[PDB]
PDB file of all heavy atoms in Angstrom:
ATOM      1  N   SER A   1      28.563-163.537-155.333  1.00  0.00           N
ATOM      2  CA  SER A   1      28.647-164.725-154.547  1.00  0.00           C
ATOM      3  C   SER A   1      27.516-164.769-153.506  1.00  0.00           C
ATOM      4  O   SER A   1      26.891-163.797-153.195  1.00  0.00           O
ATOM      5  CB  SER A   1      29.985-164.745-153.805  1.00  0.00           C
ATOM      6  OG  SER A   1      30.065-163.753-152.880  1.00  0.00           O
ATOM      7  N   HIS A   2      27.195-166.014-153.030  1.00  0.00           N
ATOM      8  CA  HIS A   2      26.232-166.262-151.999  1.00  0.00           C
ATOM      9  C   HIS A   2      24.844-165.859-152.351  1.00  0.00           C
ATOM     10  O   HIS A   2      24.024-165.435-151.543  1.00  0.00           O
ATOM     11  CB  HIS A   2      26.636-165.535-150.722  1.00  0.00           C
ATOM     12  CG  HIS A   2      27.952-165.940-150.105  1.00  0.00           C
ATOM     13  ND1 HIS A   2      28.014-167.027-149.276  1.00  0.00           N
ATOM     14  CD2 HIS A   2      29.226-165.509-150.311  1.00  0.00           C
ATOM     15  CE1 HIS A   2      29.346-167.216-148.911  1.00  0.00           C
ATOM     16  NE2 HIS A   2      30.004-166.316-149.558  1.00  0.00           N
ATOM     17  N   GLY A   3      24.513-165.983-153.652  1.00  0.00           N
ATOM     18  CA  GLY A   3      23.212-165.655-154.161  1.00  0.00           C
ATOM     19  C   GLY A   3      22.851-164.264-153.896  1.00  0.00           C
ATOM     20  O   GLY A   3      21.647-163.866-153.807  1.00  0.00           O
ATOM     21  N   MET A   4      23.848-163.329-153.819  1.00  0.00           N
ATOM     22  CA  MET A   4      23.531-161.920-153.496  1.00  0.00           C
ATOM     23  C   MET A   4      24.289-161.101-154.594  1.00  0.00           C
ATOM     24  O   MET A   4      25.203-161.609-155.247  1.00  0.00           O
ATOM     25  CB  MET A   4      24.007-161.503-152.146  1.00  0.00           C
ATOM     26  CG  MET A   4      23.109-162.110-150.985  1.00  0.00           C
ATOM     27  SD  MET A   4      23.736-161.498-149.359  1.00  0.00           S
ATOM     28  CE  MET A   4      25.140-162.551-149.134  1.00  0.00           C
ATOM     29  N   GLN A   5      23.944-159.841-154.705  1.00  0.00           N
ATOM     30  CA  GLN A   5      24.648-158.883-155.534  1.00  0.00           C
ATOM     31  C   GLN A   5      25.148-157.734-154.628  1.00  0.00           C
ATOM     32  O   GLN A   5      24.447-157.026-154.063  1.00  0.00           O
ATOM     33  CB  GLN A   5      23.719-158.279-156.587  1.00  0.00           C
ATOM     34  CG  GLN A   5      24.470-157.552-157.701  1.00  0.00           C
ATOM     35  CD  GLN A   5      23.631-157.200-158.840  1.00  0.00           C
ATOM     36  OE1 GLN A   5      22.683-157.941-159.253  1.00  0.00           O
ATOM     37  NE2 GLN A   5      23.830-156.051-159.421  1.00  0.00           N
ATOM     38  N   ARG A   6      26.521-157.703-154.534  1.00  0.00           N
ATOM     39  CA  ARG A   6      27.211-156.755-153.562  1.00  0.00           C
ATOM     40  C   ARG A   6      28.352-156.185-154.296  1.00  0.00           C
ATOM     41  O   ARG A   6      28.770-156.612-155.328  1.00  0.00           O
ATOM     42  CB  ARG A   6      27.609-157.472-152.322  1.00  0.00           C
ATOM     43  CG  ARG A   6      26.422-158.157-151.569  1.00  0.00           C
ATOM     44  CD  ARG A   6      26.953-158.937-150.343  1.00  0.00           C
ATOM     45  NE  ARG A   6      27.651-160.137-150.700  1.00  0.00           N
ATOM     46  CZ  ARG A   6      28.236-160.988-149.793  1.00  0.00           C
ATOM     47  NH1 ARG A   6      28.234-160.676-148.531  1.00  0.00           N
ATOM     48  NH2 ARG A   6      28.883-162.002-150.292  1.00  0.00           N
ATOM     49  N   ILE A   7      29.014-155.210-153.655  1.00  0.00           N
ATOM     50  CA  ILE A   7      30.278-154.648-154.059  1.00  0.00           C
ATOM     51  C   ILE A   7      31.341-155.161-153.123  1.00  0.00           C
ATOM     52  O   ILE A   7      31.253-154.843-151.866  1.00  0.00           O
ATOM     53  CB  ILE A   7      30.228-153.151-154.128  1.00  0.00           C
ATOM     54  CG1 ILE A   7      29.151-152.564-154.993  1.00  0.00           C
ATOM     55  CG2 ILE A   7      31.632-152.652-154.595  1.00  0.00           C
ATOM     56  CD1 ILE A   7      29.203-153.052-156.394  1.00  0.00           C
ATOM     57  N   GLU A   8      32.196-156.019-153.572  1.00  0.00           N
ATOM     58  CA  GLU A   8      33.397-156.479-152.858  1.00  0.00           C
ATOM     59  C   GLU A   8      34.461-155.444-152.752  1.00  0.00           C
ATOM     60  O   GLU A   8      34.710-154.660-153.697  1.00  0.00           O
ATOM     61  CB  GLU A   8      33.938-157.779-153.435  1.00  0.00           C
ATOM     62  CG  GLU A   8      35.097-158.334-152.678  1.00  0.00           C
ATOM     63  CD  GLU A   8      35.980-159.322-153.504  1.00  0.00           C
ATOM     64  OE1 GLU A   8      35.631-159.523-154.752  1.00  0.00           O
ATOM     65  OE2 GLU A   8      36.953-159.851-152.959  1.00  0.00           O
ATOM     66  N   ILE A   9      35.079-155.357-151.556  1.00  0.00           N
ATOM     67  CA  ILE A   9      36.204-154.438-151.368  1.00  0.00           C
ATOM     68  C   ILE A   9      37.465-155.292-151.154  1.00  0.00           C
ATOM     69  O   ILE A   9      37.492-156.304-150.411  1.00  0.00           O
ATOM     70  CB  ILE A   9      35.957-153.474-150.172  1.00  0.00           C
ATOM     71  CG1 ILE A   9      35.563-154.231-148.893  1.00  0.00           C
ATOM     72  CG2 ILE A   9      34.920-152.365-150.525  1.00  0.00           C
ATOM     73  CD1 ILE A   9      35.584-153.339-147.675  1.00  0.00           C
ATOM     74  N   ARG A  10      38.542-154.886-151.842  1.00  0.00           N
ATOM     75  CA  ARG A  10      39.822-155.508-151.761  1.00  0.00           C
ATOM     76  C   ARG A  10      40.902-154.445-151.394  1.00  0.00           C
ATOM     77  O   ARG A  10      40.675-153.267-151.716  1.00  0.00           O
ATOM     78  CB  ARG A  10      40.240-156.309-152.993  1.00  0.00           C
ATOM     79  CG  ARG A  10      39.367-157.435-153.364  1.00  0.00           C
ATOM     80  CD  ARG A  10      40.055-158.191-154.604  1.00  0.00           C
ATOM     81  NE  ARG A  10      39.047-158.573-155.621  1.00  0.00           N
ATOM     82  CZ  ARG A  10      38.526-159.819-155.641  1.00  0.00           C
ATOM     83  NH1 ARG A  10      38.842-160.703-154.721  1.00  0.00           N
ATOM     84  NH2 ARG A  10      37.688-160.119-156.666  1.00  0.00           N
ATOM     85  N   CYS A  11      41.969-154.873-150.826  1.00  0.00           N
ATOM     86  CA  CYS A  11      43.090-154.034-150.551  1.00  0.00           C
ATOM     87  C   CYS A  11      43.562-153.501-151.982  1.00  0.00           C
ATOM     88  O   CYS A  11      43.861-154.240-152.877  1.00  0.00           O
ATOM     89  CB  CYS A  11      44.197-154.738-149.917  1.00  0.00           C
ATOM     90  SG  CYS A  11      45.752-153.738-149.766  1.00  0.00           S
ATOM     91  N   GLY A  12      43.626-152.130-152.099  1.00  0.00           N
ATOM     92  CA  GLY A  12      44.086-151.561-153.347  1.00  0.00           C
ATOM     93  C   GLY A  12      45.535-151.897-153.708  1.00  0.00           C
ATOM     94  O   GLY A  12      45.889-151.707-154.855  1.00  0.00           O
ATOM     95  N   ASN A  13      46.321-152.262-152.708  1.00  0.00           N
ATOM     96  CA  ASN A  13      47.756-152.450-152.960  1.00  0.00           C
ATOM     97  C   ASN A  13      48.123-153.923-153.312  1.00  0.00           C
ATOM     98  O   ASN A  13      48.953-154.118-154.170  1.00  0.00           O
ATOM     99  CB  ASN A  13      48.565-151.991-151.735  1.00  0.00           C
ATOM    100  CG  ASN A  13      50.065-151.997-151.955  1.00  0.00           C
ATOM    101  OD1 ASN A  13      50.597-151.082-152.623  1.00  0.00           O
ATOM    102  ND2 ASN A  13      50.705-153.029-151.371  1.00  0.00           N
ATOM    103  N   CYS A  14      47.449-154.882-152.670  1.00  0.00           N
ATOM    104  CA  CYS A  14      47.856-156.289-152.861  1.00  0.00           C
ATOM    105  C   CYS A  14      46.631-157.154-153.279  1.00  0.00           C
ATOM    106  O   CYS A  14      46.872-158.368-153.518  1.00  0.00           O
ATOM    107  CB  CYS A  14      48.478-156.890-151.625  1.00  0.00           C
ATOM    108  SG  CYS A  14      47.345-157.234-150.302  1.00  0.00           S
ATOM    109  N   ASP A  15      45.497-156.597-153.294  1.00  0.00           N
ATOM    110  CA  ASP A  15      44.225-157.310-153.766  1.00  0.00           C
ATOM    111  C   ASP A  15      43.754-158.305-152.755  1.00  0.00           C
ATOM    112  O   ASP A  15      42.800-159.140-153.092  1.00  0.00           O
ATOM    113  CB  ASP A  15      44.493-157.997-155.070  1.00  0.00           C
ATOM    114  CG  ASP A  15      43.149-157.889-155.998  1.00  0.00           C
ATOM    115  OD1 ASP A  15      42.682-156.749-156.104  1.00  0.00           O
ATOM    116  OD2 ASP A  15      42.776-158.882-156.498  1.00  0.00           O
ATOM    117  N   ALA A  16      44.138-158.284-151.475  1.00  0.00           N
ATOM    118  CA  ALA A  16      43.612-159.161-150.448  1.00  0.00           C
ATOM    119  C   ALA A  16      42.101-158.894-150.379  1.00  0.00           C
ATOM    120  O   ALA A  16      41.707-157.798-150.346  1.00  0.00           O
ATOM    121  CB  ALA A  16      44.346-158.898-149.122  1.00  0.00           C
ATOM    122  N   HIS A  17      41.304-159.988-150.190  1.00  0.00           N
ATOM    123  CA  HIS A  17      39.888-159.789-149.947  1.00  0.00           C
ATOM    124  C   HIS A  17      39.622-159.215-148.567  1.00  0.00           C
ATOM    125  O   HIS A  17      40.131-159.730-147.590  1.00  0.00           O
ATOM    126  CB  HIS A  17      39.197-161.134-150.073  1.00  0.00           C
ATOM    127  CG  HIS A  17      37.820-161.119-149.620  1.00  0.00           C
ATOM    128  ND1 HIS A  17      36.813-160.485-150.455  1.00  0.00           N
ATOM    129  CD2 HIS A  17      37.126-161.644-148.601  1.00  0.00           C
ATOM    130  CE1 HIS A  17      35.650-160.534-149.802  1.00  0.00           C
ATOM    131  NE2 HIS A  17      35.808-161.293-148.657  1.00  0.00           N
ATOM    132  N   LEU A  18      38.804-158.217-148.489  1.00  0.00           N
ATOM    133  CA  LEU A  18      38.520-157.503-147.233  1.00  0.00           C
ATOM    134  C   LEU A  18      37.080-157.690-146.745  1.00  0.00           C
ATOM    135  O   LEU A  18      36.859-157.913-145.512  1.00  0.00           O
ATOM    136  CB  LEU A  18      38.787-155.970-147.382  1.00  0.00           C
ATOM    137  CG  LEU A  18      40.240-155.594-147.735  1.00  0.00           C
ATOM    138  CD1 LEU A  18      40.398-154.109-147.918  1.00  0.00           C
ATOM    139  CD2 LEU A  18      41.265-156.147-146.770  1.00  0.00           C
ATOM    140  N   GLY A  19      36.123-157.698-147.665  1.00  0.00           N
ATOM    141  CA  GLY A  19      34.751-157.648-147.296  1.00  0.00           C
ATOM    142  C   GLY A  19      33.944-157.022-148.330  1.00  0.00           C
ATOM    143  O   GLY A  19      34.197-157.294-149.574  1.00  0.00           O
ATOM    144  N   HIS A  20      32.908-156.262-147.941  1.00  0.00           N
ATOM    145  CA  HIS A  20      32.048-155.550-148.933  1.00  0.00           C
ATOM    146  C   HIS A  20      31.700-154.162-148.379  1.00  0.00           C
ATOM    147  O   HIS A  20      31.837-153.847-147.173  1.00  0.00           O
ATOM    148  CB  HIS A  20      30.758-156.389-149.132  1.00  0.00           C
ATOM    149  CG  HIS A  20      30.930-157.752-149.579  1.00  0.00           C
ATOM    150  ND1 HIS A  20      31.318-158.782-148.802  1.00  0.00           N
ATOM    151  CD2 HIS A  20      30.951-158.273-150.894  1.00  0.00           C
ATOM    152  CE1 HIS A  20      31.512-159.921-149.499  1.00  0.00           C
ATOM    153  NE2 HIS A  20      31.316-159.579-150.845  1.00  0.00           N
ATOM    154  N   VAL A  21      31.183-153.317-149.347  1.00  0.00           N
ATOM    155  CA  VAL A  21      30.754-151.970-148.961  1.00  0.00           C
ATOM    156  C   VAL A  21      29.273-151.837-149.266  1.00  0.00           C
ATOM    157  O   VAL A  21      28.760-152.401-150.295  1.00  0.00           O
ATOM    158  CB  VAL A  21      31.624-150.882-149.667  1.00  0.00           C
ATOM    159  CG1 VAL A  21      31.522-151.102-151.158  1.00  0.00           C
ATOM    160  CG2 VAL A  21      31.147-149.461-149.216  1.00  0.00           C
ATOM    161  N   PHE A  22      28.532-151.195-148.363  1.00  0.00           N
ATOM    162  CA  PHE A  22      27.047-151.066-148.476  1.00  0.00           C
ATOM    163  C   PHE A  22      26.621-149.654-148.295  1.00  0.00           C
ATOM    164  O   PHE A  22      27.354-148.844-147.738  1.00  0.00           O
ATOM    165  CB  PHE A  22      26.431-151.889-147.325  1.00  0.00           C
ATOM    166  CG  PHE A  22      26.769-153.359-147.381  1.00  0.00           C
ATOM    167  CD1 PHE A  22      27.784-153.896-146.519  1.00  0.00           C
ATOM    168  CD2 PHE A  22      26.091-154.269-148.209  1.00  0.00           C
ATOM    169  CE1 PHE A  22      28.135-155.228-146.552  1.00  0.00           C
ATOM    170  CE2 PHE A  22      26.469-155.576-148.197  1.00  0.00           C
ATOM    171  CZ  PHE A  22      27.448-156.076-147.391  1.00  0.00           C
ATOM    172  N   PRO A  23      25.507-149.303-148.879  1.00  0.00           N
ATOM    173  CA  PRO A  23      25.044-147.920-148.806  1.00  0.00           C
ATOM    174  C   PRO A  23      24.179-147.550-147.634  1.00  0.00           C
ATOM    175  O   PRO A  23      23.373-146.626-147.676  1.00  0.00           O
ATOM    176  CB  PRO A  23      24.256-147.760-150.098  1.00  0.00           C
ATOM    177  CG  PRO A  23      23.594-149.136-150.263  1.00  0.00           C
ATOM    178  CD  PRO A  23      24.583-150.157-149.664  1.00  0.00           C
ATOM    179  N   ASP A  24      24.328-148.237-146.466  1.00  0.00           N
ATOM    180  CA  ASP A  24      23.486-148.056-145.339  1.00  0.00           C
ATOM    181  C   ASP A  24      24.320-147.533-144.170  1.00  0.00           C
ATOM    182  O   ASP A  24      23.962-147.717-142.959  1.00  0.00           O
ATOM    183  CB  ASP A  24      22.782-149.367-144.949  1.00  0.00           C
ATOM    184  CG  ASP A  24      23.722-150.442-144.453  1.00  0.00           C
ATOM    185  OD1 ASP A  24      24.937-150.419-144.884  1.00  0.00           O
ATOM    186  OD2 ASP A  24      23.264-151.272-143.676  1.00  0.00           O
ATOM    187  N   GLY A  25      25.444-146.879-144.412  1.00  0.00           N
ATOM    188  CA  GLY A  25      26.238-146.360-143.376  1.00  0.00           C
ATOM    189  C   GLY A  25      25.908-144.969-142.884  1.00  0.00           C
ATOM    190  O   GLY A  25      24.966-144.340-143.434  1.00  0.00           O
ATOM    191  N   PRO A  26      26.609-144.450-141.879  1.00  0.00           N
ATOM    192  CA  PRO A  26      26.274-143.086-141.375  1.00  0.00           C
ATOM    193  C   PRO A  26      26.777-142.057-142.184  1.00  0.00           C
ATOM    194  O   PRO A  26      27.566-142.254-143.142  1.00  0.00           O
ATOM    195  CB  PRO A  26      26.922-143.172-139.986  1.00  0.00           C
ATOM    196  CG  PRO A  26      28.103-144.094-140.190  1.00  0.00           C
ATOM    197  CD  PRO A  26      27.711-145.135-141.172  1.00  0.00           C
ATOM    198  N   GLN A  27      26.459-140.755-141.839  1.00  0.00           N
ATOM    199  CA  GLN A  27      27.006-139.603-142.481  1.00  0.00           C
ATOM    200  C   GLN A  27      28.502-139.490-142.151  1.00  0.00           C
ATOM    201  O   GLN A  27      28.916-140.068-141.107  1.00  0.00           O
ATOM    202  CB  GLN A  27      26.258-138.383-142.049  1.00  0.00           C
ATOM    203  N   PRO A  28      29.295-138.872-143.036  1.00  0.00           N
ATOM    204  CA  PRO A  28      28.874-138.191-144.293  1.00  0.00           C
ATOM    205  C   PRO A  28      28.830-139.029-145.514  1.00  0.00           C
ATOM    206  O   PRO A  28      28.203-138.661-146.509  1.00  0.00           O
ATOM    207  CB  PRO A  28      30.014-137.080-144.398  1.00  0.00           C
ATOM    208  CG  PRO A  28      31.204-137.762-143.832  1.00  0.00           C
ATOM    209  CD  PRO A  28      30.716-138.654-142.693  1.00  0.00           C
ATOM    210  N   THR A  29      29.508-140.213-145.431  1.00  0.00           N
ATOM    211  CA  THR A  29      29.606-141.017-146.667  1.00  0.00           C
ATOM    212  C   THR A  29      28.342-141.778-146.974  1.00  0.00           C
ATOM    213  O   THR A  29      28.057-142.112-148.082  1.00  0.00           O
ATOM    214  CB  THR A  29      30.759-141.997-146.550  1.00  0.00           C
ATOM    215  OG1 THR A  29      30.463-142.988-145.573  1.00  0.00           O
ATOM    216  CG2 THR A  29      32.062-141.307-146.093  1.00  0.00           C
TER     217      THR A  29
END
């Protein structure tokens, strides 16, 4: 969506849309 390529994150239990996850975060992840 939005002319971008991203990884969407949803609630694992009910599938509510939450946002996205990006590889530019701090350590350790």
Side-chain angles (χ1 to χ4, degrees), residues 1-26 28-29:
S1 66
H2 298 272
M4 290 181 283
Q5 194 171 325
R6 302 177 288 177
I7 303 301
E8 181 199 358
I9 51 170
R10 299 186 218 266
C11 173
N13 186 77
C14 76
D15 217 49
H17 171 71
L18 303 176
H20 302 81
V21 56
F22 301 100
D24 67 334
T29 69

